[PDB]
Amino acid sequence: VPYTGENLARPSYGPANPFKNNVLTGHAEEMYISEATFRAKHR
Amino acid sequence: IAKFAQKKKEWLRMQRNRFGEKRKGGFVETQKADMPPEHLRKIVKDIGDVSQKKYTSDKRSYLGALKFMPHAVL
Amino acid sequence: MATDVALETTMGTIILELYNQHAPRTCENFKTLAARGYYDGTIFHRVIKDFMVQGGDPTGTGRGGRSIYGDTFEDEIHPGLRHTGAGILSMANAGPNTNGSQFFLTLAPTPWLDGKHTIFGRVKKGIRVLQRMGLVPTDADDRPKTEIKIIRAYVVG
Amino acid sequence: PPYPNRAGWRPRAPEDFGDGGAFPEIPVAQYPWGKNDSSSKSNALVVQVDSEGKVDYTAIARQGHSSDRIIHASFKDLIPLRQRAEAGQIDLSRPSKEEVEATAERTKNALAALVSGALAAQKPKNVQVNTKREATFVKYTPSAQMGNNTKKQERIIKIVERQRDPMEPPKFKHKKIPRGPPSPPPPVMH
Amino acid sequence: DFPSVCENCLPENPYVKMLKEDYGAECKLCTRPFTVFSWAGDGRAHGRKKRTNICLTCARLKNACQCCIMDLQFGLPIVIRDKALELIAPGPQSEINREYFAQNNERAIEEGRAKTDEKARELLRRLANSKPAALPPPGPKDWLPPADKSIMSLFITGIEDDLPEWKIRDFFKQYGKIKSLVVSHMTHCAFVNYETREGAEKAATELKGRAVIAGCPLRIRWSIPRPIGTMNKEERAEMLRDGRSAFP
Amino acid sequence: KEYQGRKRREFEDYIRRNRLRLQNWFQYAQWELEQKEFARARSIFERALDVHPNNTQLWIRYIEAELKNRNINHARNLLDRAVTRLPRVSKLWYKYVYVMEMLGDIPGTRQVFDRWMKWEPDEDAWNAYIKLEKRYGEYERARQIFA
Amino acid sequence: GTLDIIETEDGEMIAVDKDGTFFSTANATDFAQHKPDKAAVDRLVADLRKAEEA
Amino acid sequence: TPRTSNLKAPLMELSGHTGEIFTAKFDPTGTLIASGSMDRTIMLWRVYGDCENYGVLNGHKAAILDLQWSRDGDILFSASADMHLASWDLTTGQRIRRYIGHEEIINAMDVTQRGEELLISGSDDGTIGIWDPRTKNAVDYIETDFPITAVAVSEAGNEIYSGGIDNDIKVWDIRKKAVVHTMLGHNDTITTLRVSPDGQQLLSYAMDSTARTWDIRPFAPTDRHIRTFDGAPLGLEKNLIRGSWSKDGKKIAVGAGDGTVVIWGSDTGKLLYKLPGHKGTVNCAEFAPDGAPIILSASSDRTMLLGELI
Amino acid sequence: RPARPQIDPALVKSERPPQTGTVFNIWYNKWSGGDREDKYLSQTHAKGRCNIARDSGYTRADSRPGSYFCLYFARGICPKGQDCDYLHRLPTIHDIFNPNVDCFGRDKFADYRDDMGGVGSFNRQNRTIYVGRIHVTDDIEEIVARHFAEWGQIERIRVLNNRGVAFITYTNEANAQFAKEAMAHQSLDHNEILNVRWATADPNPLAQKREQRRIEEQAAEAIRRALPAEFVAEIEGKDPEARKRRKLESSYGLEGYEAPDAVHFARGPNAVNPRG
Numbered sequence A: 001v002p003y004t005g006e007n008l009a010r011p012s013y014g015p016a017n018p019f020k021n022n023v024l025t026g027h028a029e030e031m032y033i034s035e036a037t038f039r040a041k042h043r
Numbered sequence B: 001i002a003k004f005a006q007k008k009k010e011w012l013r014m015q016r017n018r019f020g021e022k023r024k025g026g027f028v029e030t031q032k033a034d035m036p037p038e039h040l041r042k043i044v045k046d047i048g049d050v051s052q053k054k055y056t057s058d059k060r061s062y063l064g065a066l067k068f069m070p071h072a073v074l
Numbered sequence C: 001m002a003t004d005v006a007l008e009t010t011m012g013t014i015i016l017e018l019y020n021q022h023a024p025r026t027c028e029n030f031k032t033l034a035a036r037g038y039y040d041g042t043i044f045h046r047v048i049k050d051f052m053v054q055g056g057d058p059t060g061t062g063r064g065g066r067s068i069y070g071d072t073f074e075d076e077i078h079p080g081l082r083h084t085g086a087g088i089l090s091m092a093n094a095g096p097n098t099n100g101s102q103f104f105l106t107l108a109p110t111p112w113l114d115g116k117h118t119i120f121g122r123v124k125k126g127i128r129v130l131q132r133m134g135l136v137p138t139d140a141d142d143r144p145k146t147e148i149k150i151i152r153a154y155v156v157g
Numbered sequence D: 001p002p003y004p005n006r007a008g009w010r011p012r013a014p015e016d017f018g019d020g021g022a023f024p025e026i027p028v029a030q031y032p033w034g035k036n037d038s039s040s041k042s043n044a045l046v047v048q049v050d051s052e053g054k055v056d057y058t059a060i061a062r063q064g065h066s067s068d069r070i071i072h073a074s075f076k077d078l079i080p081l082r083q084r085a086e087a088g089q090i091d092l093s094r095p096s097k098e099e100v101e102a103t104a105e106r107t108k109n110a111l112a113a114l115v116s117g118a119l120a121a122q123k124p125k126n127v128q129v130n131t132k133r134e135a136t137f138v139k140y141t142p143s144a145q146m147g148n149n150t151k152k153q154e155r156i157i158k159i160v161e162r163q164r165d166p167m168e169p170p171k172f173k174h175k176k177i178p179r180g181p182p183s184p185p186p187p188v189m190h
Numbered sequence E: 001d002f003p004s005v006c007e008n009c010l011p012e013n014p015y016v017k018m019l020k021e022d023y024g025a026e027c028k029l030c031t032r033p034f035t036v037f038s039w040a041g042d043g044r045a046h047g048r049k050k051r052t053n054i055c056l057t058c059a060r061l062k063n064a065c066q067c068c069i070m071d072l073q074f075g076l077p078i079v080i081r082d083k084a085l086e087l088i089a090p091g092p093q094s095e096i097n098r099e100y101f102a103q104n105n106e107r108a109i110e111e112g113r114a115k116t117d118e119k120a121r122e123l124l125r126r127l128a129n130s131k132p133a134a135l136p137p138p139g140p141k142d143w144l145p146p147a148d149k150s151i152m153s154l155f156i157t158g159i160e161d162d163l164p165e166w167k168i169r170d171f172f173k174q175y176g177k178i179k180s181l182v183v184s185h186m187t188h189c190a191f192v193n194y195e196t197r198e199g200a201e202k203a204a205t206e207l208k209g210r211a212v213i214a215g216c217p218l219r220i221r222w223s224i225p226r227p228i229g230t231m232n233k234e235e236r237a238e239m240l241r242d243g244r245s246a247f248p
Numbered sequence F: 001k002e003y004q005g006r007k008r009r010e011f012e013d014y015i016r017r018n019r020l021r022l023q024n025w026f027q028y029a030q031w032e033l034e035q036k037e038f039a040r041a042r043s044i045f046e047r048a049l050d051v052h053p054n055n056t057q058l059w060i061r062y063i064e065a066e067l068k069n070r071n072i073n074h075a076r077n078l079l080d081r082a083v084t085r086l087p088r089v090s091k092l093w094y095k096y097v098y099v100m101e102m103l104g105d106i107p108g109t110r111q112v113f114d115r116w117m118k119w120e121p122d123e124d125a126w127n128a129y130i131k132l133e134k135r136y137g138e139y140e141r142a143r144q145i146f147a
Numbered sequence G: 001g002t003l004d005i006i007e008t009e010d011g012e013m014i015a016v017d018k019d020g021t022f023f024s025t026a027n028a029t030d031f032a033q034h035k036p037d038k039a040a041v042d043r044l045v046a047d048l049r050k051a052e053e054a
Numbered sequence H: 001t002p003r004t005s006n007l008k009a010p011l012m013e014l015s016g017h018t019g020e021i022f023t024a025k026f027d028p029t030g031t032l033i034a035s036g037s038m039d040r041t042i043m044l045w046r047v048y049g050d051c052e053n054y055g056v057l058n059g060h061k062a063a064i065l066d067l068q069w070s071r072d073g074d075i076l077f078s079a080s081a082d083m084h085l086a087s088w089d090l091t092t093g094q095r096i097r098r099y100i101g102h103e104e105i106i107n108a109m110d111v112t113q114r115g116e117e118l119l120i121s122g123s124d125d126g127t128i129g130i131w132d133p134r135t136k137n138a139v140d141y142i143e144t145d146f147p148i149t150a151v152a153v154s155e156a157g158n159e160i161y162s163g164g165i166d167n168d169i170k171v172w173d174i175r176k177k178a179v180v181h182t183m184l185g186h187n188d189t190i191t192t193l194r195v196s197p198d199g200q201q202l203l204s205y206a207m208d209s210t211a212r213t214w215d216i217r218p219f220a221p222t223d224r225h226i227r228t229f230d231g232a233p234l235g236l237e238k239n240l241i242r243g244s245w246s247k248d249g250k251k252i253a254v255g256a257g258d259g260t261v262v263i264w265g266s267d268t269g270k271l272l273y274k275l276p277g278h279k280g281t282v283n284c285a286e287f288a289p290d291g292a293p294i295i296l297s298a299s300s301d302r303t304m305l306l307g308e309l310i
Numbered sequence I: 001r002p003a004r005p006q007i008d009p010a011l012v013k014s015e016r017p018p019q020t021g022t023v024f025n026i027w028y029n030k031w032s033g034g035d036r037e038d039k040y041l042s043q044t045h046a047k048g049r050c051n052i053a054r055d056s057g058y059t060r061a062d063s064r065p066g067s068y069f070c071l072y073f074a075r076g077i078c079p080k081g082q083d084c085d086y087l088h089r090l091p092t093i094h095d096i097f098n099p100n101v102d103c104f105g106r107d108k109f110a111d112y113r114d115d116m117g118g119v120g121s122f123n124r125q126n127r128t129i130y131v132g133r134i135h136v137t138d139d140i141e142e143i144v145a146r147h148f149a150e151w152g153q154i155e156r157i158r159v160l161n162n163r164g165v166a167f168i169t170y171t172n173e174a175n176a177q178f179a180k181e182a183m184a185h186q187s188l189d190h191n192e193i194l195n196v197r198w199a200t201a202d203p204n205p206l207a208q209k210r211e212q213r214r215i216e217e218q219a220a221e222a223i224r225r226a227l228p229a230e231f232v233a234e235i236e237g238k239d240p241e242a243r244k245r246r247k248l249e250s251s252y253g254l255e256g257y258e259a260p261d262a263v264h265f266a267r268g269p270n271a272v273n274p275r276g
């Protein structure tokens, strides 16, 4: 229900604030890529 | 052929590297081998009595292995 | 051509002076929604101090709002009306020509929304009620922790 | 002046605003309750208001606690609940079986993690190496920089736990620190 | 569970291989054990891996990068940031005071209790742009080289406190070859011992006892190399007025 | 600084031996006030308040140290904190209304009294607030207080 | 604008507090900016000094 | 927020694989689930009841890249990067046999469900194996010159739609062993090819993040492309993402590398859902075959999410 | 040129300190059973010194980007030559280092040693070394100027004659660290054992003022790099053209608005100001 295309299409109203990172230097998220993927891109 | 030759080449490379039986953990795995007895001999001869200042970073582990000395005696 | 709209809230009563000469479609949209009772028990989902009090959303989230001309209607930027000071009623919109049901209302002079928001009234009474609604405590997403709702909105003429 | 013949009118004071409300048709900045000069970084708490607009001192009561701490701070917390005007019918029922089992599961998980911690502390596991030393991947969207606001590239981090020497004792001598002060003491509701 | 390390301390490769060790090191700030994250650098330098040096609690309380210990908002050392914009926060560094402070802040932050400095650096730039008988001119005996070729030292007069020896030495180095250069801002004096007599003579003939160095007028002549003692306040005052009156 | 370090050491040795003794805390804070270390004396008073959170004598000492050294805003913050902490101790309420009447803020005195009346105190506090309004001539306000 | 000066049928100055914050700084949002007079602070301090001396 | 299925929860999580889940398929009756994953295993679950991992199939020497069921749900077929297919009896949980003859990684396989049962396989040696599920030897093999990553069988049972590196969906006739015609328009390698339940249209998803529906009925214009659905970006893993049609055919789902299963309407073209829930790329997205609103998403998270579409 | 070897490993062999005790402690590698006075007075002469012209050259650290200087090259006891992994060079003004490390790669500390010896502190950006045990003559200022000018680039030399102490303030902290490590236990024109430490904060209020002013100059440099030059001009307000741009842009239409500094300088992609 929250993930219906209409609900995702409707944006939040109102004007922007004239005045959400979990790490102090950015946003870090746990991820599940493949080891071969990491090794190939690193190479 | 002449337009997809490279795309075929790296597709085959990447698929074989990822799904080969030899890299079923991301890397080529081998059995742990035996070293030369002269390697162990050189290590114990060099450290000697642990008296030279080179071996301080070893001193904490050396004395720590005292906990496991009863297994070595048995 | 001014019309009174009374918002009885949990912090006092706001009397709104609606400008029928300047923004007539938006003003009569506000009259019809208040008269039907679309604002009864509806909360002020955003309060930002020295900027704004926004309400009118029946879902309380900031994405809802259903007008009387279908879903949305056009912007009425009459070039004589500006966001000149505190207590000025405007229509909150996602973008241009997207006015729905949520009403923006300035707590301070905000003259950077001219050309993109439709002023259609002001407060005629209740400016201290509005001030204290600006002084409530909120969270990181500006929603009031202490709950503010329009108990009943109706029309006086 | 009434609407819409306020042309030429130009207010000077909240007297002229009446019960307030700026006039959008006048092209001058208006202040229905007075100009704010500044706030020159005072260290004062921000004055807030309660549900029905009165000045609230429970901020003082709640200063230094979390938001969900239950703090009794008013005479209303000393009046028997069945005589509090805001309530008419109190639901005094113990939670149902599903809520009890959800609670038991959540607390059994948290306590089980602590039991495993206590067990591994009480019995160090002979050799403190793990065979299952797999890697965690972290997606890492960065924020800007110290001094640069240009955006820069998204980062995949491969984190592995380091192979430590199994013969090593612990590295650091422990210290005696006095225990810290309590959580801010609650109002004494006598 | 993830370090707060800035992008210049992080590798240039966007794909990072980090090592994580619980209780790996003492924090440099609070001297408590914390989880260390370390990564191999960019150039296979001998060195070590670049690691986090302070804990996440100290990084959050000082708004610092966890490797470089620099301020996350401007790229300054933490002491420079907080000294110049001192209205952020102090910090304790006595022994059990610093562990006590860190443990109380960490317990508070973790159990829930407990963007801010725009005004501070606007004020800093406002403050920093708020800005802070007659002696004769030199004569033919003053700009003429003496016949005593053993006298090599030139003497500079009227030195302000903000006149540094690196630019003084660069100026006299693009003129000639310097053996030594002594500058005392306490007595507004300088001695210059050159290496080449010809170079010293041609430079002093070029300047004629007058020099414009960074908007500071200086009188250069010849004098015997003398130890700058604890001169009188009137002596250094007249020394300063001589340096000022080098230019009419 | 040598003498001050010696005195600070002896004071904190007695706090470690017996933290439950108010006189240990009191003499330490009074000595720092005499040395004009107001941050240090404040810190001692607050650590004493961590050990004795509900002690009326301690709250009064701290409030009076601020008022004696003319830290009126510090003292009013302490007075709000103290009548929040101990709302049925009429001594702290009386001290707060007395301090505001000395400072000449008669609306401030009325504010403190109104918060007290919300706590529904005893007859002596209701009488004191009636007598405040009679002192300043507001007989209708005193009539409302009798209601 | 918090006080209305009105005249009734008797033609007299009656002030009306629109809020209730004329007489008390309770419910006043600006209750924390009464900076007291220097004479008042001196009188309170001398009161406390007299208590200390006694 | 109603209740639209006979599940224990509106969304359940099935975990227990120790590697990326590359495929997950429903029973023809839609009550059992077989998931094949890079820990070289197949895990067998019951969706109803509460949920129960009732089976584990072991024997493959590399990652399980595809699997399919029989017409009635007693034999499971699976293609794996050990260059083998395998057929497994699920009453005894034992491998019936292995199908050998492919020389590279077998990327895809399909099973012909009507008429008489067959196995079709597409593999990186540029081959499409036609296997009878009674002999370990291949009945036939189509020999291309490009690797093949997705295969599907026409409902008639004698045309094979195959896509691979060459970005073209080649429709082949089996009995001629020859290409009838090539649908063109994709730009990167086709990851899934699936026919609709009524049988007149073909979903294809490629690595250019476009899911295109094509026409399949023999009367069609020269450009056979119906629509190009968007909303599911390929991430940074070059995985073979497997979408599906709804049982009624009105909905069309694929997986997306941002951990999201994306569902459109096949008739209209509007993004019906963008359901989240996964931390790796979503490798498989399957609608329930019994007409339920149940959606299944299998990711490289070592887990899968089984939800209802309320 | 390649880095030359300064001495030879035949005298850079590793061996015990000379015996000042009954028994050699192998954990702490120290002599035991002796006294304490001997240790206090014993501070021997340096065994070498290095030359920019003769010794400084190229090495595998000049090959490898982002490496450190050689501490043993600074002490003049580096027999490694071209095969050392650390730079054989004086730092220039472009050689900067983070607060957590010094120019030799050794970790810096939150504190100082109680004798102000060692690596240094990141809690004070100290560029001033303290050179004691100087033979008091009249040419001491010339000798100090010559030797420390050889060791780097100087902002302020302050030599006291009463106690024979030279305070040298370099303009680069790396230069100060190199000078301390290269001048400890060395000798001037007379044979003496220099006590080169980190100087304490100067109690002279002129020096306090100039150090504080340098702190705000460095910080404001960082601020002006962080902020756009047009916010810099508007906030600085030293010129009337940027002042009148400030009034107009803060007006945003309406006369007499004077927008808040937070709203007007709130940086972001789409906040208020087109300068963002």
Ligand SMILES: [Zn+2]
Binding pocket: E027, E028, E029, E030, E031, E032, E054, E055, E056, E057, E058, E059, E102
């Ligand atoms: Zn720390």
Ligand SMILES: [Zn+2]
Binding pocket: E005, E006, E007, E008, E009, E010, E065, E066, E067, E068, E069, E070
């Ligand atoms: Zn950093």
